[PDB]
């Protein structure tokens, strides 16, 4: 057995064995995680209107 992706679409499970449900993450935490994933994938005419 090896930890993989989160079975629920509403959670983030890392290979570290830690799971993160989205609703409870802070906005600042969500931003950095999104950027972390981004780094992960990166290396991997009408007449009246014209006057008026």
């Amino acid at each position: 057995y090896n930890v993989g992706k989160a079975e629920k679409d509403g959670e983030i499970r890392l290979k570290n064995g830690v799971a993160m449900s989205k609703e409870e993450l802070t906005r600042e935490d969500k931003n950095r995680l999104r950027r972390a994933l981004k780094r992960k994938r990166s290396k991997a005419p009408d007449s009246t209107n014209i006057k008026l």
């Binding site: 906005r27 005419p45 007449s47 014209i50 006057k51």
Partner: protein, 815 residues
């Protein structure tokens, strides 16, 4: 060159911000874009206008347009006003000094509301960034930041310092304990967003998007972990549009409280809280009626609770205007009558009052006694023209033309008219021509102060553009009907000839020499007619979109044209050839001016930017960004000194030319923390640092944190370099880690490895030491490490065989 600088801003009675009212019946401070306006209701005139500085167009002035002030907050006792702006900065201007004394910037976005505390020491500021900052005036800094709200704060109520209520565009009420610095209780205002929040003692009224408005009872000392704020009843206001803002006002003499709901609709509904005794009798009346109905006693209670909210609040009256109400505020309450000032969206303020007796107000309908329209136009000024003497500035809007003397800056007379598209100042200046959307021509006279004669059938459709010759005898009119009409003046106006054209005339526009006349058409080609011979000379081609403005150089050898394609083309007369095409404004350039007797030209666009270019250079001398909203019109003075530009928000504006390495970090970490331990122990023996106090964690925990910060790969060599005299300190620290069993169990593995790399490193040197006390430390540390490691093995072990049992049992069951 000479820098064009903005002299005077006027024509705006008010802007989009909350009104500030004070009694001396009072004095109203209105917002004027970035600038702040003071007005007096008694005289209905502007007392003074407060500009922070950085005049538009100046080198110090920022290229970006100055931000309109989002909110106005003033404490009458301190006599200081504070204004928040769109960028999130707060400017605190003293009422008397009329200049800034303090600047706060803690909001990443525009600020919704600003709240002064009762003492005046500090301010709670809430913003669209969902961060609310508690600014201390003496401290000039935010004590704490309130971010639990996921969206903009529509409002927040902080009558009591210890507890605060906040409503936000997330739709959520949040109870904030200012000691805790975190929100204790949170609940939904509405499924939709709550825009209005006000509280009267326990009852707390919140206005959702739809007509329904909920009342929450709050018991600040409930402290049951829940139900601090609880719903009494939900009452439907008459207006469907959401309630932006709500206030209570109460009369001390009669003990009567009234509250209005500032509906996004123009109608403003005001309701009266029935007397508790009058509530009881009404309840006793309603039950008697419900007995007459024959409803069951349980149903009687259900009707009462539904009518409970109606029992507390009685509809008092509703205030209707002609136009939408941008802001409102209780001014005063008297036993005879209430007063209220409200600022409309179209920039006039009217002061309503309600005489009342007992339950039903005496006044059948609200009456505005004070109103101001003489400095401000409800309708945006479509066309502006300047007098030849340059004394008098003409500003033509829909339903009104306003003429202002540049020196006085006050309107001299106002003319009633229609939806005027274009304005022209007659020859000699005793008169003005406008062209309306109805098509009827207008002849105005400055001397008489009124329209002379309106020719209803002068033209079929609307005159969209209009001209006058240099001599002025001949009048040319441009329109959508696709037909130009020529009109001549006599000591009466007669129509000399009519020109048929294929396409709608966007711009009739004439040369000074009167040699030729340009025509702008929706077909994106600008034809040129000789005006004297009346025959077509040349047509501009290649305009992506129709030409919004046409322009002839002073020498008359160039034709500058600004187009809806947002590009300006400059065509030479001799051959009708564009020398250069310039995408100046990111939005379309509506009108373009010259500097008289110069190749330079000024431009205006819906982006509100004004740009100054030179013909020989073909580049822009200076960029101007002062206009908050789109500038509809641009005018050039006959002198050329002052260039008039008017915004969509009614702003009339005129421009005039002038290191420690890892491992070592562990060492001093040992020195600092250990030095404290001996100090504590020495103090302990007696009875029988500044950074650390800022750290506010125990020395061993701080040493422990440093240990985690040190990299494990570079841990070994870090422990290698570490001298033995420090190791005695390290053993002493590990001894102190043990005294708190919890601290070890948190990081037992890392602590163990480190003590092990030490003992192996200095084993031969350690055996040399014969100090008995060190042995007692070595005795003690051993025993509990063994207990801790044994306990983990005991707990770790217990799982494997027991879990082996259930797997074996299931295997036997399912084999």
């Amino acid at each position: 060159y000479q820098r064009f600088e903005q002299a005077a801003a006027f024509g705006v009675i008010a802007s989009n911000a909350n009104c500030v009212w004070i009694p001396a019946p009072g004095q109203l401070i209105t917002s004027a874009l970035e600038d702040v306006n003071i007005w007096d209701i008694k005289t209905g005139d502007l007392v003074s206008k407060l500009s922070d500085g950085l005049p538009p167009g100046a080198s110090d002035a920022r290229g970006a347009k100055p931000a309109e002030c989002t909110y106005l907050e003033a404490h009458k006792d301190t006599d200081l006003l504070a204004v928040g702006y769109a960028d999130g900065v707060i400017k605190v201007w003293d009422l008397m000094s009329k200049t800034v004394l303090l600047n706060f910037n803690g909001h990443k976005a525009a600020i919704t509301l600003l709240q002064f505390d009762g003492t005046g020491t500090r301010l709670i500021s809430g913003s669209k960034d969902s961060n609310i900052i508690v600014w201390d005036l003496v401290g000039e800094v935010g004590l704490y930041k309130l971010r639990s709200h996921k969206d903009s704060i529509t409002g927040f109520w902080c009558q009591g310092e210890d507890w605060l209520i906040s409503t936000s565009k997330d739709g959520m009420i949040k109870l904030w304990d200012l000691k805790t610095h975190q929100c204790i209780e949170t609940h939904i205002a509405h499924t939709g967003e709550c825009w209005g929040l006000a509280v009267k003692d326990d009852l707390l009224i919140t206005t959702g998007t739809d007509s329904q408005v909920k009342i929450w009872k709050l018991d600040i000392e409930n402290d049951k972990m829940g139900g601090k704020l609880t719903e009494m009843g939900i009452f439907e206001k008459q207006s469907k549009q959401r309630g932006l803002k709500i206030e209570f006002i109460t009369n001390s003499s009669d003990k009567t409280s009234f509250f209005y709901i500032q509906n996004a609709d123009k109608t403003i509904e005001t309701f009266r809280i029935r007397k508790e005794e009058e509530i009881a009798r009404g309840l006793k009346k309603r039950e008697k009626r419900l007995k007459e109905k024959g409803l069951t006693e349980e149903e009687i209670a259900k009707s009462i609770k539904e009518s409970y909210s109606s029992f507390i609040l009685h509809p008092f009256q509703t205030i209707r205007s002609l136009y939408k109400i941008k802001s409102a505020s209780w001014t005063t309450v008297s036993s005879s009558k209430l007063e209220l000032v409200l600022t409309t969206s179209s920039n006039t303020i009217e002061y309503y009052s309600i005489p009342y007796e007992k339950r039903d107000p005496t006044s059948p309908a609200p009456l505005k006694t004070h109103t101001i329209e003489l400095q401000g136009q409800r309708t945006d000024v479509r066309s502006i023209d300047i007098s030849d003497d340059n004394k008098l500035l003409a500003t033509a809007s829909n339903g009104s033309l306003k003429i202002w003397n540049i020196k006085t800056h006050k309107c001299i007379r106002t003319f009633e008219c229609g939806y005027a598209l274009t304005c022209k100042f007659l020859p000699g200046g005793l008169l003005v021509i406008l062209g309306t959307r109805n098509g009827e021509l207008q002849l105005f006279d400055l001397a008489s102060s009124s329209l002379l004669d309106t020719i209803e059938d002068a033209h079929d459709a609307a005159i969209w553009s209009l001209d006058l010759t240099s001599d002025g005898k001949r009048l040319v009119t441009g329109s959508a009907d696709k037909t130009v009409k020529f009109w001549d003046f006599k000591v009466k106006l007669h129509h000399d000839t009519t020109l048929e054209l294929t396409d709608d005339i966007l711009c009739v526009r004439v040369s000074p020499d009167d040699r030729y006349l340009a025509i702008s058409l929706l077909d994106n080609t600008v034809k040129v007619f000789f005006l004297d011979s009346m025959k077509f000379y040349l047509s501009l081609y290649g305009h992506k979109l129709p030409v919004l403005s046409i322009d002839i150089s002073f020498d008359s050898k160039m034709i500058i044209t600004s187009s809806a394609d947002k590009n300006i083309k400059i065509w030479g007369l001799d051959f009708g050839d564009c020398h250069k095409s310039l995408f100046a404004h990111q939005d379309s350039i509506m009108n373009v001016k010259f500097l008289p007797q110069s190749h330079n030209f000024f431009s205006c666009s819906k982006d509100a930017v004004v740009k100054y270019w030179d013909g020989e250079k073909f580049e822009c001398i200076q960029k101007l960004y002062a206009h908050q909203s789109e500038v509809w019109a641009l005018a050039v003075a006959t002198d050329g000194g002052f260039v008039v530009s008017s915004s969509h928000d009614h702003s009339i504006r005129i421009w005039e030319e002038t290191s420690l390495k890892a491992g070592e970090r562990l060492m001093e970490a040992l020195d600092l923390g250990i030095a404290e331990i001996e100090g504590l122990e020495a103090y302990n023996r007696d009875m029988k640092n500044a950074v650390l106090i800022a750290v506010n964690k125990t020395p061993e925990q701080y040493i422990m944190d440093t240990l985690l910060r040190i990299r494990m790969s570079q841990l070994e060599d870090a422990l290698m370099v570490m001298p033995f005299s420090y190791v005695l300190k390290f053993l002493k620290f590990i001894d102190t880690v043990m005294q708190n069993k919890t601290l070890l169990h948190s990081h037992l593995p890392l602590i163990c490895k480190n003590l092990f790399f030490i003992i192996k490193f200095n084993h031969k040197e350690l055996v040399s030491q014969k100090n008995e006390e060190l042995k007692l430390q070595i005795n003690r540390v051993k025993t509990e490490l063994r207990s801790a490691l044994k306990s983990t093995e005991d707990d770790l072990g217990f799982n494997v065989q027991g879990l082996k049992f259930v797997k074996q049992q299931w295997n036997l069951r399912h084999n």
